[PDB]
Design an enzyme around this catalytic site. Structure first.
Site, PDB file in Angstrom:
ATOM      1  CB  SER A 144      -1.043  -0.099   1.109  1.00 42.02           C
ATOM      2  OG  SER A 144      -1.764  -1.303   0.994  1.00 42.02           O
ATOM      3  CG  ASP A 242      -5.648  -1.458  -4.784  1.00 43.28           C
ATOM      4  OD1 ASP A 242      -4.748  -2.228  -4.400  1.00 43.28           O
ATOM      5  OD2 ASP A 242      -6.059  -0.497  -4.097  1.00 43.28           O
ATOM      6  CG  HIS A 286      -5.735  -2.524  -0.243  1.00 42.95           C
ATOM      7  ND1 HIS A 286      -5.091  -1.820  -1.237  1.00 42.95           N
ATOM      8  CD2 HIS A 286      -5.362  -1.951   0.927  1.00 42.95           C
ATOM      9  CE1 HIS A 286      -4.377  -0.848  -0.693  1.00 42.95           C
ATOM     10  NE2 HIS A 286      -4.520  -0.909   0.619  1.00 42.95           N
TER      11      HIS A 286
HETATM   12  O1  LIG Z   1      -1.734   4.770   0.829  1.00 48.58           O
HETATM   13  C1  LIG Z   1      -2.323   4.944  -0.188  1.00 48.58           C
HETATM   14  N1  LIG Z   1      -3.298   3.975  -0.667  1.00 48.58           N
HETATM   15  O2  LIG Z   1      -3.170   2.614  -0.334  1.00 48.58           O
HETATM   16  O3  LIG Z   1      -2.068   6.096  -0.929  1.00 48.58           O
HETATM   17  C2  LIG Z   1      -0.703   6.375  -1.085  1.00 48.58           C
HETATM   18  C3  LIG Z   1      -0.602   7.127  -2.407  1.00 48.58           C
HETATM   19  C4  LIG Z   1      -1.288   8.318  -2.560  1.00 48.58           C
HETATM   20  C5  LIG Z   1      -1.220   8.992  -3.766  1.00 48.58           C
HETATM   21  C6  LIG Z   1      -0.466   8.491  -4.810  1.00 48.58           C
HETATM   22  C7  LIG Z   1       0.216   7.300  -4.651  1.00 48.58           C
HETATM   23  C8  LIG Z   1       0.140   6.609  -3.454  1.00 48.58           C
END
Ligand SMILES: O=C(NO)OCc1ccccc1
Ligand SMILES: *[C@@H]1O[C@H](CO)[C@@H](O)[C@H](O)[C@H]1NC(C)=O
Ligand SMILES: O=C(NO)OCc1ccccc1
EC number: 3.1.1.98
Length: 340
Positions: A144, A242, A286
């Protein structure tokens, strides 16, 4: 895995408490797995204050436990982890709320510290005295926000080890569930990341920064834009549908939504066409790599632990040992092995 708080106490979680890492050594192994935890992010004072009230372990080490159980790719049991069960295992908690990009200390002008990029650097430096100096492979993995963190940090780790005098350690990345699209929503994301980078003093990889230039570094948080600029080998794990992607897209079935979902899977599949090490099943889910049942999912008859083993062999095509595994069927759960 046992907790160690950083000896350099100026490298801190959001609230100024020391950051740290959990370690289980395997002295008969020269492989090292460093895993970055995820858990969204916060992008201004009010949103970070809310996170401090009800998600405090993601902002502070004051309440962390002395041990953690290794699961999935962090398990030491061959039945649970066919890929790397004998490796040295490291879990790095996410306490910086900055997608692992930050380089800003708490001060009279900053209520919170955002030090994700420096936390990774300091963990690496302190592990070199605990056996990492003898490594042959360092795999930087994450799920993530931690998967995006791999993309943002793997080349900096490789440069750090070269400059410190360890050019023989091979640095590689494994990014799980951190490959997102800056697409149109189903009902009416990049604004929050643009604001966040300014709030965190966030840093992105140098080649990607030079392409997009000032004010546009937010682009480097999107896998399909940052990946082509990277030199270290990176294996990409990404569900085609996702759940974090769908939440930001405001999806929670009639023709308009059917077409929206099918187009999302097609676009994700397209972004992976030229990623030679990848595993992308047609499931609504996820995260995967630290789940105990990560061994169960398959694409074209090949499991994720097998694909990662085939990747290892490729870095020494292989008969019966594929490394690029992307589903072509167009709807969630068209793959029978998806998580229930
Ligand atoms: O943590 C998360 N989602 O699982 O967002 C992180 C992120 C936010 C914006 C762009 C890429 C990655
Ligand atoms: C501790 O970390 C800070 C922030 O990265 C750095 O400026 C400082 O040099 C470090 N101290 C030591 C002794 O490495
Ligand atoms: O920009 C968008 N679409 O509106 O989402 C980007 C994104 C998706 C999922 C997780 C973080 C960031």
């Amino acid at each position: 895995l046992r907790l160690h708080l950083l000896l350099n106490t100026s490298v801190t979680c959001n609230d100024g408490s020391p950051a740290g890492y959990y370690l289980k050594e395997s002295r008969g192994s020269r492989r090292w797995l460093l895993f970055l935890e995820g858990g969204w992010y916060c992008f201004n004072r009010e949103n970070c204050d809310s996170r401090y009230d009800t998600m405090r372990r993601l902002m502070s080490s004051r309440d962390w436990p002395r041990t953690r159980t290794g699961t999935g790719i962090l398990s030491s049991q061959p039945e649970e982890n066919p890929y790397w069960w004998n490796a040295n295992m490291v879990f790095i908690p996410y306490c910086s709320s900055d997608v692992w990009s930050g380089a800003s200390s708490k001060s009279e002008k900053n209520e919170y510290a955002f030090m994700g990029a420096l936390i990774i650097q300091e963990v690496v430096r302190e592990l070199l005295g605990r056996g990492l100096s003898g490594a042959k492979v360092l795999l930087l993995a994450g799920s993530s926000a931690g998967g995006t963190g791999v993309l943002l940090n793997v080349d900096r780790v490789a440069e750090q080890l070269e400059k410190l005098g360890y050019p023989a350690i091979q640095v590689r990345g494994l990014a799980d569930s951190g490959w997102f699209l800056d697409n149109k929503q189903y009902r009416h994301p990049t604004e929050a990341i643009r604001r966040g980078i300014r709030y965190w003093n966030g840093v992105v990889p140098e080649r990607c920064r030079r392409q997009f230039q000032e004010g546009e570094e937010w682009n480097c948080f999107f896998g399909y834009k940052v990946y082509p600029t990277l030199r270290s080998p990176v294996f990409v794990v990404q569900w085609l549908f996702d759940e974090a992607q769908l939440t930001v897209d405001n999806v929670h079935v009639q023709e308009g939504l059917r077409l929206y979902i099918q187009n999302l899977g097609r676009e994700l599949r397209h972004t992976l066409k030229d990623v030679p090490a990848s595993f992308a099943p047609a499931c609504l889910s996820h995260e995967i790599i630290i789940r105990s049942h990560w061994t169960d999912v398959q694409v074209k008859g090949t499991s994720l632990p097998r694909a990662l083993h085939c990747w290892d062999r490729s870095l020494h095509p292989l008969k019966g040992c594929p490394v690029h595994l992307v589903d072509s069927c167009p709807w969630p759960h068209c793959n029978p092995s998806c998580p229930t």
